[PDB]
């Protein structure tokens, strides 16, 4: 009952958002009592993407564990252990499985069609520090040989480059403009440890605070 469990959790969170509408901390104070490692929540209305985002000391802490520390293939949607929330870095990466059952990050594949992108331009993302909009501006298929997983850059020229390639590789086109002064969030599919599947799907969005 992994699905039902997520449903249960999603339902609790909806109540929390309604309850503490004009707030931001209380919802995650609540979530923390579940697992202090839940640093946020990601949601795209109309899609299966509606789960908590955890973060452990490493990038494998939650690859195969769900929000309540239960052993699961599909694990959790998790934030790169290197990223900071209070003071968000240039690019913040969270990962999730793509097993082909419309769960976790199966939705990322959909952002590869221009039409899906037009009707799902913004993804919701919240945490103890505020509410945010993730305005997608790039979605492409790649591999583990290309690191779109870079956290910070030596300088704007360096970050400009990264942003440039990010758009060049995009399979979709978007009116959203991103500059070296904007913050970014990349969403990436992931594979179990020691998996020889090196192919990945990445979606990059401009982080905008609306809280």
Pairing of strands 91-97, 122-127: unpaired
- Domain annotation for the chain: domains and CATH numbers: 1-211 (2.40.260.10)
Q: Where are the beta strands (DSSP E) in the chain?
A: 38-43, 50-54, 77-79, 91-97, 122-127, 130-143, 183-190, 199-209
> What is the maximum span of the chain, computed from C-alpha positions, in angstroms?
49
Rg for the chain, CA atoms, rounded? 16
Resolution (A): 2.0
The set of residues, in sequence order, having a beta carbon less than 8 Å from that of 137 and lying 6+ positions away, is: 167, 170, 174, 176, 177, 178, 204, 205, 206
Question: What does the block give as tokens for 167?
Answer: 């758009």
**Per-residue exposure over 95-106, b if at least 16 CB sit within 10 Å of its own CB, e if not:** bbbbeeeebbbb
Which residue do the tokens 């690191």 mark?
A: 147
The set of residues, in sequence order, having a beta carbon less than 8 Å from that of 15 and lying 6+ positions away, is: none
HSE of 135 in the Cβ direction (CA atoms, 13 Å)?
Answer: 13
Question: What letter does residue 109 receive in the DSSP assignment?
Answer: G
Which secondary structure element, helix H or strand E, spans residue 164, and what is its range? helix 156-169
* Cα-to-chain-centroid distance, residue 82: 14
Which residue do the tokens 């239960």 mark?
A: 70
Question: What does the block give as tokens for 87?
Answer: 């003071």
What's phi and psi for 107, nearest 5 deg? -60, -25
Cα separation of 178 and 184, whole Å?
9
> Are the C-beta atoms of 62 and 54 separated by less than 8 Å?
yes
Positive or negative: CA dihedral 166, 146, 86, 154: negative
Which one, of 129, 122, 181, 186, lies nearest residue 155 by Cα?
181
The set of residues, in sequence order, having a beta carbon less than 8 Å from that of 16 and lying 6+ positions away, is: 26, 27, 30, 31
Which one, of 182, 23, 19, 207, lies nearest residue 125 by Cα?
207
> Are the C-beta atoms of 37 and 55 separated by less than 8 Å?
yes
> Are the C-beta atoms of 203 and 186 separated by less than 8 Å?
yes
Q: Which residue numbers are catalytic?
A: 190
């Amino acid at each position: 009952q992994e699905r039902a469990n997520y449903e249960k959790l999603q339902q609790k969170f909806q109540m929390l958002m309604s309850k503490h509408q004009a707030h931001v901390r209380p919802q995650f104070e609540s979530l923390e009592k579940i697992n202090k490692d839940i640093v946020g929540w990601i949601k795209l209305s109309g899609t299966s993407l509606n789960y908590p985002v955890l973060q452990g000391k490493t990038n494998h802490d939650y690859l195969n564990l769900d929000f309540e520390r239960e052993h699961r293939r599909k694990g959790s949607i998790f934030m790169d252990f290197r990223n900071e929330l209070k003071n968000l870095n240039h690019n913040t990466i969270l990962y999730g499985h793509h097993v082909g059952d419309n769960t976790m990050f199966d939705v990322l594949e959909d952002y590869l069609k221009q039409s899906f992108y037009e009707k799902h331009k913004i993804i919701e993302f919240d945490n103890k520090y505020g509410k945010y909009q993730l305005q997608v501006f790039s979605a492409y298929k790649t591999t583990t040989k290309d690191n779109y997983i870079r956290t910070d850059f030596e300088n704007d020229q360096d970050y400009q480059q990264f942003l440039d390639e990010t758009k060049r590789k995009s399979v979709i086109n978007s009116d959203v403009n991103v500059t070296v002064k904007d913050k970014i969030m990349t969403l990436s599919t992931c594979e179990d440890a020691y998996s020889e599947t090196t192919k990945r799907i990445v979606v990059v969005a401009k982080i905008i605070k609306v809280s």
